[PDB]
Design a protein around this motif. Structure first.
Motif, PDB file in Angstrom:
ATOM      1  N   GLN A  79       0.819  -1.211   0.000  1.00 40.46           N
ATOM      2  CA  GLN A  79       0.000   0.000   0.000  1.00 40.46           C
ATOM      3  C   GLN A  79       0.855   1.264   0.000  1.00 40.46           C
ATOM      4  N   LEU A  80       1.950   1.244   0.753  1.00 44.53           N
ATOM      5  CA  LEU A  80       2.809   2.435   0.820  1.00 44.53           C
ATOM      6  C   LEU A  80       3.527   2.671  -0.511  1.00 44.53           C
ATOM      7  N   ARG A  81       4.004   1.573  -1.066  1.00 43.85           N
ATOM      8  CA  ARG A  81       4.669   1.580  -2.382  1.00 43.85           C
ATOM      9  C   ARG A  81       3.727   2.196  -3.413  1.00 43.85           C
ATOM     10  N   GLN A  82       2.483   1.714  -3.478  1.00 42.54           N
ATOM     11  CA  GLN A  82       1.510   2.261  -4.383  1.00 42.54           C
ATOM     12  C   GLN A  82       1.166   3.719  -4.111  1.00 42.54           C
TER      13      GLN A  82
ATOM     14  N   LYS B 168      13.338  12.136  -8.544  1.00 39.09           N
ATOM     15  CA  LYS B 168      13.865  10.929  -7.872  1.00 39.09           C
ATOM     16  C   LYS B 168      13.159  10.788  -6.525  1.00 39.09           C
ATOM     17  N   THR B 169      12.540   9.630  -6.337  1.00 35.37           N
ATOM     18  CA  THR B 169      11.798   9.427  -5.125  1.00 35.37           C
ATOM     19  C   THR B 169      12.129   8.076  -4.482  1.00 35.37           C
ATOM     20  N   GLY B 170      12.430   8.054  -3.200  1.00 39.95           N
ATOM     21  CA  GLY B 170      12.605   6.794  -2.487  1.00 39.95           C
ATOM     22  C   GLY B 170      11.248   6.226  -2.097  1.00 39.95           C
ATOM     23  N   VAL B 171      11.029   4.945  -2.405  1.00 42.06           N
ATOM     24  CA  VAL B 171       9.804   4.219  -2.122  1.00 42.06           C
ATOM     25  C   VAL B 171      10.025   3.256  -0.961  1.00 42.06           C
ATOM     26  N   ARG B 172       9.465   3.655   0.178  1.00 45.28           N
ATOM     27  CA  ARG B 172       9.608   3.008   1.518  1.00 45.28           C
ATOM     28  C   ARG B 172      11.028   3.329   2.009  1.00 45.28           C
TER      29      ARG B 172
ATOM     30  N   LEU C 130      11.577   0.119  10.640  1.00 43.90           N
ATOM     31  CA  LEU C 130      11.053   0.412  11.966  1.00 43.90           C
ATOM     32  C   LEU C 130      11.426  -0.680  12.934  1.00 43.90           C
ATOM     33  N   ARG C 131      11.827  -0.293  14.112  1.00 47.13           N
ATOM     34  CA  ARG C 131      12.182  -1.256  15.121  1.00 47.13           C
ATOM     35  C   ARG C 131      10.952  -2.097  15.566  1.00 47.13           C
ATOM     36  N   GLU C 132       9.848  -1.419  15.815  1.00 44.98           N
ATOM     37  CA  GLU C 132       8.556  -2.086  16.180  1.00 44.98           C
ATOM     38  C   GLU C 132       7.741  -2.210  14.923  1.00 44.98           C
ATOM     39  N   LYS C 133       7.838  -3.353  14.269  1.00 44.80           N
ATOM     40  CA  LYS C 133       7.129  -3.522  13.002  1.00 44.80           C
ATOM     41  C   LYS C 133       5.592  -3.357  13.097  1.00 44.80           C
ATOM     42  N   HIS C 134       5.016  -3.538  14.274  1.00 43.02           N
ATOM     43  CA  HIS C 134       3.578  -3.344  14.391  1.00 43.02           C
ATOM     44  C   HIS C 134       3.190  -1.909  14.054  1.00 43.02           C
ATOM     45  N   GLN C 135       4.135  -0.996  14.155  1.00 39.62           N
ATOM     46  CA  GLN C 135       3.867   0.408  13.839  1.00 39.62           C
ATOM     47  C   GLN C 135       3.579   0.633  12.367  1.00 39.62           C
ATOM     48  N   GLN C 136       4.014  -0.264  11.495  1.00 41.47           N
ATOM     49  CA  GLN C 136       3.732  -0.118  10.085  1.00 41.47           C
ATOM     50  C   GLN C 136       2.238  -0.034   9.829  1.00 41.47           C
ATOM     51  N   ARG C 137       1.489  -0.874  10.532  1.00 42.94           N
ATOM     52  CA  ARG C 137       0.034  -0.874  10.472  1.00 42.94           C
ATOM     53  C   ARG C 137      -0.598   0.085  11.446  1.00 42.94           C
ATOM     54  N   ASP C 138      -0.159   0.014  12.698  1.00 37.54           N
ATOM     55  CA  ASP C 138      -0.776   0.793  13.786  1.00 37.54           C
ATOM     56  C   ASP C 138      -0.636   2.293  13.611  1.00 37.54           C
ATOM     57  N   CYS C 139       0.434   2.710  12.919  1.00 38.88           N
ATOM     58  CA  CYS C 139       0.702   4.135  12.709  1.00 38.88           C
ATOM     59  C   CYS C 139       0.860   4.408  11.252  1.00 38.88           C
ATOM     60  N   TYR C 140       0.139   3.665  10.418  1.00 40.28           N
ATOM     61  CA  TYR C 140       0.270   3.784   8.965  1.00 40.28           C
ATOM     62  C   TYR C 140       0.105   5.211   8.421  1.00 40.28           C
TER      63      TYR C 140
ATOM     64  N   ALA D 172       0.362   8.140   9.890  1.00 39.51           N
ATOM     65  CA  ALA D 172       1.439   9.027  10.327  1.00 39.51           C
ATOM     66  C   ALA D 172       2.740   8.715   9.565  1.00 39.51           C
ATOM     67  N   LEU D 173       2.949   7.427   9.321  1.00 39.93           N
ATOM     68  CA  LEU D 173       4.136   6.968   8.609  1.00 39.93           C
ATOM     69  C   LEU D 173       4.073   7.426   7.184  1.00 39.93           C
ATOM     70  N   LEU D 174       2.896   7.290   6.589  1.00 45.05           N
ATOM     71  CA  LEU D 174       2.688   7.752   5.207  1.00 45.05           C
ATOM     72  C   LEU D 174       3.009   9.236   5.096  1.00 45.05           C
ATOM     73  N   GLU D 175       2.616  10.030   6.104  1.00 43.00           N
ATOM     74  CA  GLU D 175       2.904  11.452   6.068  1.00 43.00           C
ATOM     75  C   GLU D 175       4.400  11.739   6.079  1.00 43.00           C
ATOM     76  N   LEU D 176       5.096  11.058   6.972  1.00 40.80           N
ATOM     77  CA  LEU D 176       6.547  11.233   7.100  1.00 40.80           C
ATOM     78  C   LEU D 176       7.316  10.745   5.884  1.00 40.80           C
ATOM     79  N   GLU D 177       6.898   9.614   5.356  1.00 43.24           N
ATOM     80  CA  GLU D 177       7.466   9.119   4.099  1.00 43.24           C
ATOM     81  C   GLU D 177       7.275  10.184   3.000  1.00 43.24           C
ATOM     82  N   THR D 178       6.040  10.671   2.879  1.00 41.23           N
ATOM     83  CA  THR D 178       5.692  11.657   1.823  1.00 41.23           C
ATOM     84  C   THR D 178       6.593  12.878   1.963  1.00 41.23           C
TER      85      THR D 178
END
Ligand SMILES: C[S@@+](CC[C@H](N)C(=O)[O-])C[C@H]1O[C@@H](n2cnc3c(N)ncnc32)[C@H](O)[C@@H]1O
Ligand SMILES: C[S@@+](CC[C@H](N)C(=O)[O-])C[C@H]1O[C@@H](n2cnc3c(N)ncnc32)[C@H](O)[C@@H]1O
Lengths: 247, 244
Positions: free
Chosen positions: B17-20, B193-197, B203-213, B215-221
């Motif tokens: 989903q993040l990649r897309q 040029k854009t880095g994808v993920r 992330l150290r706590e992988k559950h954050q990928q989903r739990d904080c998706y 917020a993560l998407l915002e920071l990635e963007t």
């Protein structure tokens, strides 16, 4: 959780690290660069200024190699900690302790220096260009600046890995984490010639299983050593060590 | 929760989903810059067509080619499930695509294919050859640096020490500095040029990928289009123009 008992670790027979792994790795990578530059500068002993030397670990090691070291620091407590660690290591005869700001160090020095150590201090000063100019003015032509500064990108990466999203999103650990691009510009603007750039702790802080920092320290050190002088790893270092010479 | 299921596919993976999402930020930006007119888009190595379909949903004519007959069967069947009218399918290597095209295309998608081919420079040249002057290449490649950092973060030190020999493992993860050179020497004008993920996989706590998706998407963007983060992407998406 994984069992870390003695019998489980691949490096079980390697020496333990007495202090912190962050510190041991920092020292190792820094001294790879310092030994390389010291060998370049020939066999003669040097006059070395360690501005913002703190408790003097690096300065004391520099004094162990025969050089006359001048440690300067704003903290009287740091100076008293330094004097004592130095006596303990029997090198009190090869060092000076000046209680002052690096910005005022020129008034406390008699002749120029060959090498200046400014490690983990640039991120604590509000007048970085001015401090760099002071340093440039007390260094002899041909001399070298060993500048290690706290990298803002390392800060961001560390906090993203750690899941501290609210902090990275809002901002407001040293007062002025630095942008490496701006530091290099400051150096070049003043006329310094940059010789090398090394990331200090490019992987260590980001490990998912932090126990590996200690349990796999030697394997980690080999890979840090391998990649720390290539991009993007340089720019992901918690600190960046830039060696620069005054022409 | 409430807003989560309506903004991404909860049956999908956060990595996909993040990649897309990041890819489409760039694609939507390019599509707008290319003017309101509908485009002829070639998806070379389009696979099951996830992206080709989203392109055709935006109303463009999409041509999907792929070496694998099986991929093409899934693409068509996914296309119908109802944009089959805006799509065309070709069973061939990207290297052999020209003969199969009636006219040149406006935009080429070459996503997650460069790391699988033994002749990357040759294939990029073929793509240039079927693209109109002023056309755009959307190139997404698997990044060697992202692979290295992923492994380091995961503690796979012996694997990195050995140089990550192939052991879902592309044969040839790419060095972005080299890919950029390849594009520039061949005459492409790099636009973005854009880095994808750039954070997600580390992330150290992988559950954050989903739990904080979100917020993560915002920071990635926010950080994925500047260095060093671009270079830490698991993939890098480069947009390049064939000069007019
Ligand atoms: C984080 S420590 C680094 C100490 C040491 N150089 C090292 O590498 O471990 C920063 C040191 O700089 C000192 N300091 C901060 N601002 C300074 C300034 N303007 N002039 C000299 N020392 C300074 C502090 O008291 C502290 O001991
Ligand atoms: C990992 S997939 C990527 C699919 C799609 N582009 C995406 O972004 O999800 C790689 C695809 O490229 C196809 N492929 C590999 N080499 C190719 C070539 N030389 N010409 C055409 N297609 C190729 C494979 O069959 C596969 O469907």
């Amino acid at each position: 959780m994984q069992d870390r008992n003695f019998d489980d670790i691949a490096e079980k027979f390697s020496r333990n690290i007495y202090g912190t792994t962050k510190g041991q790795l920092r020292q190792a990578i820094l001294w790879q660069d310092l030994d390389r530059v010291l060998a370049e500068m020939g066999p003669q002993k040097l006059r070395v200024l360690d501005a913002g030397g703190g408790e003097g670990q690096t300065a004391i090691k520099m004094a162990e190699r025969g050089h006359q070291v001048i440690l300067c620091d704003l903290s009287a407590q740091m100076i008293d900690r330094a004097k004592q660690a130095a006596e303990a290591k029997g090198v009190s005869d090869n060092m000076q302790f000046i209680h002052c700001a690096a910005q005022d160090v020129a008034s406390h020095l008699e002749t120029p220096v060959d090498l200046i150590l400014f490690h983990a201090v640039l991120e604590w000063v509000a007048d970085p260009r001015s401090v760099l100019q002071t340093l440039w003015s007390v260094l002899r032509p041909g001399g070298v600046l060993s500048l290690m500064f706290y990298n803002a990108h390392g800060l961001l990466m560390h906090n993203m890995v750690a899941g501290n999203f609210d902090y990275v999103q809002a901002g407001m650990s040293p007062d002025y984490p630095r942008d490496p691009t701006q530091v290099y510009l400051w150096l070049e603007e003043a006329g310094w010639q940059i010789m090398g750039k090394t990331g200090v702790r490019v992987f260590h802080d980001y490990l998912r299983e932090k126990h590996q920092q200690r349990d796999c320290y030697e394997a980690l050190l080999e890979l840090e050593t391998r990649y720390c002088r290539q991009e993007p790893y340089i720019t992901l270092g918690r600190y960046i060590h830039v060696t620069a010479r005054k022409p």
